[PDB]
Amino acid sequence: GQIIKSIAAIRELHQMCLTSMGPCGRNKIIVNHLGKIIITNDAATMLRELDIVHPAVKVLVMATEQQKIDMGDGTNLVMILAGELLNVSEKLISMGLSAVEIIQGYNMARKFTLKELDEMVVGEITDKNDKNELLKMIKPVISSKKYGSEDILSELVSEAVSHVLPVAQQAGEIPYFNVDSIRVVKIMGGSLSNSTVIKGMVFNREPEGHVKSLSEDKKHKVAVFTCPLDIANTETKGTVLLHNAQEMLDFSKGEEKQIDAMMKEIADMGVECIVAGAGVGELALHYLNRYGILVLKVPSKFELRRLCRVCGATPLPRLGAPTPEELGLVETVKTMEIGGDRVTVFKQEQGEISRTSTIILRGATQNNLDDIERAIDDGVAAVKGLMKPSGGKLLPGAGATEIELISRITKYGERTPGLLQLAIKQFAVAFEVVPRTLAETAGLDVNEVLPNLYAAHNVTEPGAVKTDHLYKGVDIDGESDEGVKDIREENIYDMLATKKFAINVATEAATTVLSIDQIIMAKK
């Protein structure tokens, strides 16, 4: 009976994910063996930081990572739903039903569910990319993660998305929004109300020079130099040495006139910013102070990729060749104090629209600072789901989707004759874990809210056309309430691309576990 104990091993980790989805969710502190503490609310990220013993657990972990890579949202919906399909299948094992027909029953029920998703679409997203229109998609993403920040972070995330998107409509051929266009930075001090939206990358380091910021001139030229600043010598070896004191005056003054000659030609071309990926010498910073050139050092090669897509600069393998064709152009750059420390940021005005933006976060809490950093990344992939593959269609969330499917699946159960009726009935009951989890973790009584959810989607109407309100979902309460409330008041919806993709992944996840009747292991 190891197939029964295999579900119990997942059941131990099932209750861990039941405390994740919903507003009651909380991050888990994990101390790595290297002395580094990683804290995140996302359950998919935690799976990489946990040591897996039983190999059957990795099956659900691999399916969970698929939800984060493609759609980026719904990782908690895949793991929780896949864990419940094993519990409803455990009763069929004790009943005597073979696991072969159980797998065949899910394949027939999956095709019936996908055909009903097109009829459950309420609204359609016009892809206007307006600041007020993006508030409906971003609100449920921030919801059920961090409480109280949903109102403040709604305007910060929606504003940064509209900056990187150009003006276009009804065109899906050329992609625009990427996953790297939104970067999250953190700084000690401040609050969430004082946070602003930047149209470009934000640098929290020091300029390392006497020039704090450039002027207001239009189209500042920015050059990226991968070669370090130093006198040109032989690429092979070429170490500067002093044999006698006579050559000291020639070598010292030789490097001063050589560097100044290269900086003079760059300043004549109109380049007010020099990006040096490598170290900068001592004599190089002295000449850049009089010419008024901002000093910037970016040793990380990952940040230079998003910089070339904004101003248009190109990295030069050599030094002293300011080719005007490969130079970048930025409208305005300024150095201001944000969060208590003076830093040099990167923004724009009108032309040279940036394809990458960065949101500055401020707060007095260290634990909640890294939690919002991981929460915004989940909202970045939500914009990617607005493309042609069912980006405009949406379904009502807050547990209203799983409850509404109960009436439609049970209607097709008696319609299909044969032994498949056992798997179809258990397939709809497995959706009851979503409303029960939100009601149990919120302190609400099961004998109260749960029977009201069944009566919300099932009523007696003297007519063929549906009426009254089908939008009533699961309410978290927390203060007081009578019955349930309409979800359309808070405008909490779920995209079709996220819900439809989570069904096929969760179906194949539980299919693999039920299909394995034997597991062979060996000690290392």
Next chain:
Amino acid sequence: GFFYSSADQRDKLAASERKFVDAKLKKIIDLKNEVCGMDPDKGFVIINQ
């Protein structure tokens, strides 16, 4: 490496690297004009391992 100290020395030092490149490149671009130049809806692909 080839490091030039003046604009005139840029094409002189780099001429050794582009000597073999320009020899083959100028002969390939002439094939597109002589052959398959007028024919619409066609293309020319180079493998270049």
